[PDB]
């Protein structure tokens, strides 16, 4: 179906073969420090290595100053990238930040403002020639038509991407769950993911432990595994490529089961 791979440095991800799990590195902050404390990182490396072991195929590393985020995250990318043999994605909207990460050893860029926040980002994706993820997100929540608007808004991201010079191969789409959407907006979007596909790019769907699960099911964050299940399952028969989850053990076994049913 996809005839192209996610060439990304020393690694490459194959879209046809299986659903590709992105593991959320939870960036618990050693407050007494801004930078690479031993606990801070070890703890992070401990937790990636784990996820390596859980079936996860990429690691995600999430008003605050740039400088910090750079001292925060540049010594962290650098341990894991050097310790864990998998591609590593940065979770920033900042271009000054984007650079440093990829400079550290970061692989795929994950943006929650989809080149809108700081256009300069896209240029940097161009430059180090690396996949970027664009997310739907906005600063009000007035939609004539949820989807039609999403798909619009997504499109004015791709514009900047493609204008700055990102190859189509290096572009990924994220519907951006829990951003700028009431929890009924979130549902509808889940109901109608599949129209993200007309647009001809991989979709990554991020729903682990999200507050709409708790709106429906009425159960809080540490009891949201099952919710996350369904969103990932429906997520997938609707043809999405990556899912970005916390619970790697459990979702990884849900991916593979759907992957065998829909015959992926």
Ligand X SMILES: Nc1nc2c(c(=O)[nH]1)N=C(CCNc1ccc(C(=O)O)cc1)CN2
The residues annotated as belonging to the active site are: 210, 244
Secondary structure (3-state) at 58: strand
Secondary structure (3-state) at 92: coil
Q: CB 206 → a copy of itself: shortest distance, Å? A: 15
Q: CB 190 → a copy of itself: shortest distance, Å? A: 5
Please name every residue paired with 203 in a beta bridge, in sequence order, or none if there are none.
173
- Binding mask 10-49 toward ligand X (x if CB under 6 A, else -) reads ----------------------------------------
Q: Which is nearer to a copy of itself, 78 or 186 (CB)?
A: 186
Please report which helix (H) or strand (E) contains residue 25, including its range: strand 20-25
Segment near a copy of itself (CB under 8 A), from 6-14, 22-30, 140-148, 254-262? 254-262
- CB contact set of 180 (below 8 Å; sequence gap of 6+): 136, 137, 138, 139, 140, 141
Segment near ligand X (CB under 6 A), from 36-44, 188-196, 204-212, 247-255? 204-212
**Applying CB under 6 A, does 178 fall inside the site for ligand X?**
yes
Segment near ligand X (CB under 6 A), from 75-83, 114-122, 138-146, 209-217? 209-217
- Tell me how far apart the alpha carbons of residues 190 and 169 are, in angstroms, rounded to a whole number: 25
Backbone angles phi, psi at 121, to 5 degrees: -50, -55
- Tell me how far apart the alpha carbons of residues 149 and 144 are, in angstroms, rounded to a whole number: 7
Packing angle of the helix pair 66-83, 38-52 (nearest 10 deg): 50
The one among 19, 36, 219, 220 contacting a copy of itself by CB under 8 A: 219
Tokens for 237? 């028969």
- Tell me how far apart the alpha carbons of residues 135 and 1 are, in angstroms, rounded to a whole number: 23
The one among 213, 240, 243, 248 contacting a copy of itself by CB under 8 A: 213
Segment near a copy of itself (CB under 8 A), from 12-20, 22-30, 111-119, 223-231? 223-231
**Applying CB under 6 A, does 91 fall inside the site for ligand X?**
yes
**Secondary structure letter of residue 148 according to DSSP:** H
The one among 112, 121, 150, 154 contacting ligand X by CB under 6 A: 112
Report yes or no: 19 and 241 within 8 Å, Cβ to Cβ: yes
Q: Tell me which residues in 141-200 interact with a copy of itself (CB under 8 A).
A: 187, 190-191
**Applying CB under 8 A, does 231 fall inside the site for a copy of itself?**
yes
CA angle, residues 223, 225, 230, in degrees to nearest 5 = 130
- The footprint of a copy of itself (CB under 8 A) covers 187, 190-191, 213, 216-217, 219, 226-227, 229-231, 233-234, 237, 250-251, 253-254, 256-258, 260-263
């Amino acid at each position: 179906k996809w005839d192209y791979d996610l060439r990304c440095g020393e690694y490459t991800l194959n879209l046809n073969e299986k659903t590709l799990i992105m593991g959320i590195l939870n960036v618990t902050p050693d407050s007494f420090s801004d930078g690479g404390s031993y606990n801070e990182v070890d703890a992070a490396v401990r937790h990636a290595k784990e996820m390596r072991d859980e079936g996860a195929h990429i690691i995600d590393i999430g008003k605050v100053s740039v400088e910090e985020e750079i001292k925060r995250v540049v010594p962290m990318i650098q341990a894991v990238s050097k310790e864990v043999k998998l591609p590593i994605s940065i979770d920033t909207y900042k271009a000054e930040v984007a650079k440093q990460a990829i400079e550290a050893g970061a692989h795929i860029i994950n943006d929650i403002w989809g080149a809108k926040a700081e256009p300069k980002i896209a240029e940097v994706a161009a430059h180090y020639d690396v996949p970027i993820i664009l997310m739907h997100n906005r600063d009000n929540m007035n939609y004539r038509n949820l989807m039609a608007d999403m798909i619009a808004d997504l499109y004015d991201s791709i514009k900047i991407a493609k204008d700055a010079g990102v190859r189509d191969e290096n572009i990924i789409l994220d519907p951006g769950i829990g951003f700028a959407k009431t929890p009924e907006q979130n549902l509808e979007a889940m109901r109608n993911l599949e129209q993200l596909n007309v647009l001809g790019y991989p979709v990554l769907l991020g729903t682990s432990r999200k507050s709409f699960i708790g709106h429906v099911l009425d159960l809080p964050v540490e009891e949201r595994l099952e919710g996350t299940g369904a969103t990932v399952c429906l997520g997938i028969e609707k043809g999405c490529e990556f899912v970005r989850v916390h619970d790697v053990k459990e979702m990884s076994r849900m991916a593979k089961m759907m992957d065998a049913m829909i015959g992926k």
